Amino acid sequence: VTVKDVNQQEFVRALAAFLKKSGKLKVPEWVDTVKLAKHKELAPYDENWFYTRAASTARHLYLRGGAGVGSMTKIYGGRQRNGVMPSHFSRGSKSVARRVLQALEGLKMVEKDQDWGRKLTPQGQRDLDRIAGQVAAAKKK
């Protein structure tokens, strides 16, 4: 099937499962000391963070290829409560998503887009679209 017909969240969760068990996807450099878009004042708790974040950058590349830090951290971000201040938006972790893109661009599941960016390979497309049919025929939520 198409990777749209699977649930968006379980698509990325099982994408993280596949890449994690393949062990290739970047394992964390420091698990809980990441500030992760400092609008997220607290920390990430479990070492299954980078799997999902890189998987989701790959999925947003599927949504549209050739993206970048400014145009992916925008959707990755959200709302923050600012103590004695109101809420603005200033996207945080740049090198986390950059290292996502590097760890997959050296992996040739995301390839160079024209003039800049990270575009999509037939290999990444085929792998993710197989896992899509896998998950869809399996149970779902």
Partner 1 sequence: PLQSVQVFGRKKTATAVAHCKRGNGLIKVNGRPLEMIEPRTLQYKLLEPVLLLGKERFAGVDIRVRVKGGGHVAQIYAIRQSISKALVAYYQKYVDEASKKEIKDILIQYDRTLLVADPRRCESKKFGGPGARARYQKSYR
Partner 2 sequence: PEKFQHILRVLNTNIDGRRKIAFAITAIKGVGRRYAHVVLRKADIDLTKRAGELTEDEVERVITIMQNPRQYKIPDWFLNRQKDVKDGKYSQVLANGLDNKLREDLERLKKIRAHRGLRHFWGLRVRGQHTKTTGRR
137 binds partner 1 (CB under 8 A): no
Output the smallest distance, CB 21 to RNA, in A.
18
Q: Between residues 43 and 63, which has the closer beta carbon with respect to partner 2?
A: 43
Q: Which helix (H) or strand (E) holds 16?
A: helix 8-21
Q: Between residues 24 and 113, which has the closer beta carbon with respect to RNA?
A: 113
Output the smallest distance, CB 43 to partner 2, in A.
5
Residues 5-34 contacting partner 1, CB under 8 A: 5, 7-8
Output the smallest distance, CB 140 to partner 1, in A.
11
Q: Are 1 and 133 in contact (CB under 8 A)?
A: yes
Q: Between residues 5 and 32, which has the closer beta carbon with respect to partner 2?
A: 32
Residues 4-23 contacting RNA, CB under 7 A: 4-5, 8-9, 12
101-105 contacts, C-beta under 8 A, 24 or more apart: 101/57, 103/25, 103/26, 103/54, 104/25, 104/54, 104/57, 104/58
Q: Which of 8, 18, 9, 26 is nearest to 95 (CA)?
A: 26
By CB under 7 A, name the one of 21, 22, 27, 63 that touches RNA: 63
67's tokens = 């993206």
How far apart are alpha carbons 71 and 65 in whole angstroms?
A: 11
- Per-residue binder mask for RNA (CB under 7 A), 68-97, x = binder: xxxx--xxxxxx-x-xxxxxxxxxxxxxx-
2's tokens = 């198409």
Residues in contact with partner 2 by the rule CB under 8 A: 30-33, 42-43, 45
